[PDB]
Design a protein around this ligand. Structure first.
Ligand SMILES: [K+]
Ligand SMILES: [K+]
Lengths: 365, 365
C-alpha cells in the first residue's frame, strides 16, 4: 500500500539540522545520500498525514488533489532507494538525479495550495477554519524545510549551496526595497523613499553579516516593504506627500533585528493578526489577461509565509501597529549559526488531537 | 463548613462588567447591594479554589497563609448578608460598611503575596513553577477586579467613583514621568528627559481623553518609565550622555496607544518574556534600615501587574526590543467604554486541568 509507506515513515520524527550542520555538509555526496534517503521520506510522510486530515471540501479541491499527487509521486521515487546499495556509485548518481529532479519540477506548490483554499472558500465554516490555519502554517513550514534539503543537495552535488556564510544584510534589504518600489511605482504612480540606519553593537561601524539563506531574508524584507508601501500609499493618497519607510538594522550579541517602520495609519489590535490568517488573506489571484498593475497586497500569503521563514531558523517576525499613526514590523534572526536550528512540524498524537479537538478558564467578552 | 461556602460559590462564574456599566451605576445604593452580595462571594470563592491548588511549599508560607486568611475572613463577612433583607435600610448601611471595611483594610495583598513567593524560593521546581505563573496572573487579575468593585461601591456610597469619564491621558503620563524621574535622580544622580508627541487621529489637534481609571493608567506608565529609565541609565553609564525617553500617544477609532521608546540597549528575544515572569522577577524586598536609594527594578511585580491592568479592560501591554539598541513598550487601551469589558478568571474544570496537566507537535530545539 501507499498509505502503508506513509504510515511507516510518519511514525518517525523529522530530524532538525542547525545552520552550522548544513554548513558542514558543504565541505561528500555519499554522506548526504544516507541522510536524505531516510530524512526525505520521513518529512514527506509526516506532512502527508496532515493533508489527509483537512476538511473534505478542501482536500477534494482540484488544486489540493494536484499537490497531494505530487507529494505521493515524490515519496515513491525517494523510497525507490531505501535498500539500493550505499556503496553503489550509480545509485548515488540516481539519487542526486532524483533529488535534482524533484527540486526543479514543483516550484508551484505554494500558489497551488493557495488556489485550493480559494476553490474551498468559493464552493463552500469556523470550526474547521482553525484546522486550516494550523495545517497551512505546518504545511508551508514543512515545505520550506523540504525545499532547503533539496536545494542544498542539488546545489552542492549538481556560498555553501543556498547558504551564504557572509550574508550582506543591508545589500539584501536594499534589493528588497528596490524591487518593492518598482511594483509600488507601477500601482500607485509614486512610492515612499527608504531611510536605512544600521548599528553593529557587536562590532561598531563594521558591516553587518550573518550566516543565512539570502533568498529567505529577501522574501521577508520584500514582502514587508510591499505591506509598508501599500499602507503608506493608501493612507496619504489625498495629501500626495508620502512619508519614507524607515529601516533600522541592529546586530546584537544574540539577535540580528530588522525593524521596518511606516506611517501608513496602522491597524487596531483586534485586526492586526488577520494579516497572518490564511482564510482572511485569501485574495483573488491576479488575472493574466490585463495590462493593469498588480496590487501590492493580495494573493500568495506573503506575510504569513515571511513569518514562517523567520521562525524556520528560530527567528520571528512581529508586527505592532499604532492605529491612526503607523506600523512597525520586526524581523528577528539568530545572530549565531549554532542557535539557528530548523523548526519542524511533527505528526503524532498531539498533531492529530489538534484537528479533532476544541479557553473556558477565562470569562468571554 | 467554610470549604462548603467556597465550593457552592465557586460553581458560579464571575459576571464581567463593561466600563459603560460601571459608569451607569454612578447615577442607587440598593441596586449595588443586590449585585455585590452575590458577585463578591462568587469572585472571592473562584480565586480561593486556585490558592488551594498552589504547590504545598508555596501555600504553606506565612505570607500566603496570611493572604488566604484575609480572603476567608472577607468571604465570611459578605456571606453574612446573603439572606438579610434587600428592603432593609440597616442591612444596606451594614453592607456599604462591610465593603468600606474590607476595602480600607488590605491594601497590602500584592507585596504580601510577592513575599510568599520569596519565602517559597528561599526554602525550596520547574513543573510547578508553570503553575505559579498561571496562578499569579489569575490571582492578581482577580484582585484588580475585586478591588475595582470595592472601590466603586465605597467611593459612590461612602469622577464616577474611580472612573474618570474624561481621563486626561497626557496629564497622567507626565505625572508618571515626573514620579519615575525623581526616583531615577535619587538612584543614578541623573535621568533621561521626556519627549512627548501626540496624535488625535479621531479628532486632530484636540485633547486626547478616554473613559478610564486614572490610577490604572498611572501604574502602567509609571512602571514603564522606571523600566525605560533603568535600562537607559545602566546602558549609557560610561558616556554620561543619556538619551531621552520618547512617548507617542495616538487616539485611533478603536485603540488608544501609548508607545514608550528607550535607547537602553535592549534585551534579546529569548529573554524579553522574563520581564513578565513572576519567579524570575522575584527580587529582594528593599530593606527599611537604610538611606540608600531604592533601585528602579526589583521587588513588587511592576511590569507583569502593569500588563494585567492593560488586559483587565481588553487592552494589552507589549514589549519589543532590539538587542544592542533599545526597547519599545506599547500600552493598548480600548478607546470606547463599550469595548472595555472586565477580563475575569473563572474556576472550573479547565482551570483545574491547567494545574494538573502537562507542544509535542513540533520538534524541540
Ligand atoms: K512522526
Ligand atoms: K466557577
Amino acid at each position: 500500500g501507499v498509505p502503508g509507506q506513509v504510515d511507516f515513515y510518519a511514525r518517525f520524527s523529522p530530524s532538525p539540522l542547525s545552520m552550522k550542520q548544513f554548513l558542514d555538509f558543504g565541505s561528500c555526496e555519499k554522506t548526504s545520500f544516507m541522510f536524505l534517503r531516510q530524512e526525505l521520506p520521513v518529512r514527506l510522510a509526516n506532512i502527508m498525514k496532515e493533508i489527509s486530515l483537512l476538511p473534505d471540501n478542501l482536500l477534494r479541491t482540484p488544486s489540493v488533489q494536484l499537490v497531494q499527487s505530487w507529494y505521493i509521486q515524490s515519496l515513491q521515487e525517494l523510497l525507490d532507494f531505501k535498500d539500493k546499495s550505499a556503496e553503489d556509485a550509480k545509485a548515488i548518481y540516481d539519487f542526486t538525479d532524483t533529488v535534482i529532479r524533484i527540486r526543479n519540477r514543483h516550484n508551484d506548490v505554494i500558489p497551488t495550495m493557495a488556489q485550493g483554499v480559494i476553490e474551498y472558500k468559493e464552493s463552500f465554516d469556523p470550526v474547521t477554519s482553525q484546522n486550516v490555519q494550523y495545517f497551512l502554517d505546518r504545511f508551508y513550514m514543512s515545505r520550506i524545510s523540504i525545499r532547503m534539503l533539496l536545494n542544498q543537495h542539488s546545489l552542492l552535488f549538481g556560498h555553501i549551496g543556498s547558504i551564504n556564510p557572509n550574508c550582506n544584510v543591508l545589500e539584501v534589504i536594499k534589493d528588497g526595497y528596490e524591487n518593492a518600489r518598482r511594483l509600488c511605482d507601477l500601482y500607485y504612480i509614486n512610492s515612499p523613499e527608504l531611510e536605512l540606519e544600521e548599528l553593529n553593537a557587536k562590532s561598531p561601524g563594521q558591516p553587518i553579516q550573518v550566516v543565512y539563506v539570502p533568498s529567505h531574508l529577501y522574501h521577508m524584507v520584500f514582502e514587508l516593504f510591499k505591506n509598508a508601501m501599500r499602507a503608506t500609499m493608501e493612507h496619504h493618497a489625498n495629501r500626495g506627500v508620502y512619508p519614507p519607510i524607515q529601516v533600522h538594522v541592529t546586530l546584537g550579541n544574540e539577535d540580528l533585528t530588522v525593524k521596518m517602520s511606516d506611517r501608513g495609519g496602522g491597524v487596531p489590535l483586534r485586526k492586526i493578526d488577520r494579516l497572518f490568517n490564511y482564510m482572511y488573506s485569501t485574495a483573488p489571484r491576479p488575472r493574466v489577461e490585463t495590462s493593469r498593475a498588480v496590487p501590492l497586497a493580495g494573493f500568495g500569503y506573503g506575510l504569513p509565509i515571511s513569518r514562517l521563514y523567520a521562525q524556520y531558523f528560530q527567528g520571528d517576525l512581529k508586527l505592532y501597529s499604532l492605529e491612526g499613526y503607523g506600523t512597525d514590523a520586526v524581523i528577528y534572526i539568530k545572530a549565531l549559526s549554532t542557535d539557528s536550528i530548523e523548526r519542524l512540524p511533527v505528526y503524532n498524537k498531539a498533531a492529530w488531537k489538534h484537528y479533532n479537538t476544541n479557553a473556558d478558564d477565562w470569562c468571554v467578552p
